[PDB]
């Protein structure tokens, strides 16, 4: 379900973080 | 993993979009 996201300066977009990437 | 996430300037973090 809902997950924590971080901003990727490399991809210029928000990506999810699940203890692996 | 359904709705899109974007950077919120108000919260200074990535959040989910609305609308359904």
């Amino acid at each position, epitope marked *: 379900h809902e997950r*924590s*996201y*971080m*901003f*990727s*300066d*490399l*991809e*210029n977009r928000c*990506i999810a*973080a699940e*203890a*692996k*990437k | 993993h359904e709705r899109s996430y974007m*950077f919120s300037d108000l919260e*200074n*973090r*990535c959040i989910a979009a609305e609308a359904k």
Partner: antibody, heavy 127, light 109 residues
């Protein structure tokens, strides 16, 4: 205080493998991710990947994902990096570094900088 | 990949002088995940700044990080002999951990 002690210098022939250890003290080993970074003579520091000692989860740089192995022994507060199929370009100083602490309201990986570094382990690869 | 370019290559200064290190990124770093490190030959690198402007524990106020977007800077108000080294900038988090080539803070005589 927070300390990271690495294993001694190594010398290997091309094609072989090397395993470097990083022993931590001064903090809760299972609460912090550990990065592995190297620096070859005349080259820029090069990130290799990280490992979460608690669950063994990890992330690899595309450059080493196929031949590097990250492991951890929580009962010994030690993290290991094994690089296989060694080549001349692998001659370098290999460092382990602990990530920084975090606050409940930060964003993911805001603390993923190299907070504390080990002094590095020299690895020489030559025929 | 994100590419970081540091300037100048070498910084020759005498104790007491102001040191200004520059670091240019290929991508805009909106996350502010930028750090600066100090490295003395033969010793473990040391974190100086994280999050662009947060001074690492044990770091003197004479050190200060700043910048935004594509241009970041490390400044030492008054250079002390203990400061001569190598200084590196780096972006971290979200699968991007590239470092700049470094700037050597050398003592002028």
């Amino acid at each position: 205080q927070v300390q990271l002690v690495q294993s001694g210098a190594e010398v290997k022939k091309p094609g072989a493998s090397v395993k470097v250890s990083c022993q931590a003290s001064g903090y809760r080993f299972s609460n912090f991710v550990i990065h592995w970074v190297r620096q070859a003579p005349g080259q820029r520091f090069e990130w290799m990947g990280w490992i979460n000692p608690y669950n063994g989860n990890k992330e690899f740089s595309a450059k080493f994902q196929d031949r590097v192995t990250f492991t951890a022994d929580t009962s010994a507060n030690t993290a290991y990096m094994e690089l296989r199929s060694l080549r001349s370009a692998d001659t370098a100083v290999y460092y382990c570094a602990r990530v920084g602490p975090y606050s409940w309201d930060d964003s993911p990986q805001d603390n993923y900088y190299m907070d504390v570094w080990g002094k590095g382990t020299t690895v020489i690869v030559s025929s | 990949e994100i590419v970081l370019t540091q300037s100048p290559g070498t910084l020759s200064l005498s104790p007491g002088e102001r040191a200004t290190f520059s670091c240019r990124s290929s991508h805009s770093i909106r996350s502010r995940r930028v750090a600066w490190y100090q490295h003395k030959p033969g010793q473990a690198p040391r974190l100086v700044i994280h999050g662009v402007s947060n001074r690492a524990s044990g770091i003197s106020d004479r050190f200060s990080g700043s910048g935004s977007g594509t241009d970041f800077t490390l400044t030492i108000t008054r250079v002390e002999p203990e400061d001569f080294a190598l200084y590196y900038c780096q972006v971290y988090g979200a699968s991007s951990y590239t470092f700049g080539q470094g700037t050597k803070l050398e003592r002028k005589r």
